[PDB]
Structure 1
């Protein structure tokens, strides 16, 4: 599990955690339509798909500095609503599930040298 080896990886992971935590808070209030998925005209609101888009955009800026490359962005970042996963009996608007894929930025390591002398 190479990922959680260096302490650098751990500190950067904590940094991404606190950054995303202090970032998501602009989705408080908002109002998130989840049945008609059609925000009206003149009312501040967002749709789960729009939220996923926002999250992706965000995760596509801190890349290189906090994350590294996000191989398959279509799968590493997933946002599933409560109703989506749970067959609708036990569903309740407001609950969402976000899951990402942390990949510490690759660092330098050993550089094996094989200098082989000769004449002329």
Structure 2
């Protein structure tokens, strides 16, 4: 309630920082005193933070982005704020289950990038002969079948670990490819239509370190 700045200016600064000046590589988190500093906003120094630490913890745990000044004092000089957590308002799940899949804003960017990249890769199968009843391809023909396509997709997924994905829990259960004739009842399937299911994880990064410091004295 006591925020001393025009609310929309801070929102505009945060959006501008998070949109273009930083996120041409989608895996970066806009946080900290270096990558999350709103250097274009200045406010007077104050001994009071606006939010108590317990309130900050509650806001963070309830899907709200919190921010604070870079330095503190009672003299009232100008300082810039920075973002503590770059988090979306996601909680629970479409099936009402609490999880952290979309907790970080970078997760959405990575999901969009993965969708686009997988769309681009699959274009090579557009208008390519497909064999589904007798899977032997005569000599000289340019074509493919289900198993070879799945092998190529597995290779692509494996080659992207460390760029778009963390290591797969079980590659044999995370990627599955099926044809329409296998799914739809008899006489209802369509030729050259496939179903693909893929499960992935985003890369992990350092988040927190809990330090226990135990001073002692020279002895013996």
1:65 pairs with 155, 163, 172, which one?
A: 163
Aligned pairs, how many?
120
Which stretch shifts more, 84-93 or 100-109? 84-93
Deviation at 1:74, TM superposition (A): 0.3
From the two aligned structures, give the one with the greater helix fraction: 1
Q: TM-score, normalised by structure 2?
A: 0.53
Distance 1:106 1:74 in 2: 22
1:23 alignment counterpart? 121
Q: Is the 8 A contact 1:37 1:47 kept in 2?
A: yes
Does 1 or 2 have the higher relative contact order (CA < 8 Å, sep 6+)?
1
Deviates more, 1:42-51 or 1:81-90: 81-90
100-109 vs 79-88, which moves further: 79-88
* In 1: Cα distance, 2:212 partner to 2:182 partner: 57
**Distance in 1 separating the partners of 2:206 and 2:101:** 14
CA contact (8 A) 1:67 1:104 kept: yes
- Structure 2 residue ranges without an equivalent (≥5): 1-98
What's the Cα RMSD here?
Answer: 1.1
Distance 2:186 2:162 in 1: 39
Q: Please give the alpha-carbon distance, in whole angstroms, between the structure 2 residues aligned to 1:9 and 1:18.
A: 14
Q: Could you tell me how far apart the structure 2 residues matched to 1:100 and 1:5 are?
A: 20
- Tell me if structure 2 keeps the 8 A contact 1:3–1:104: no
Higher strand share: 2
CA distance in 2, matches of 1:13, 1:115: 40
Aligned mates of 2:212, 2:169 — CA distance in 1: 33
Instruction: Provide Cα deviations, 1:33-88, integer angstroms capped at 9, x if missing partner.
Output: 11101111111000011111110000000112101111100010111111122343
Could you tell me whether the CA contact under 8 Å between 2:183 and 2:189 is conserved in 1?
Answer: no
* Alignment TM-score, normalising by the size of structure 1: 0.94
8 Å contact 1:13–1:102 — kept in the other structure? no
Alignment partners' CA distance in 1, 2:213 and 2:191 = 65
2:130–2:143 Cα contact (<8 Å) kept = yes
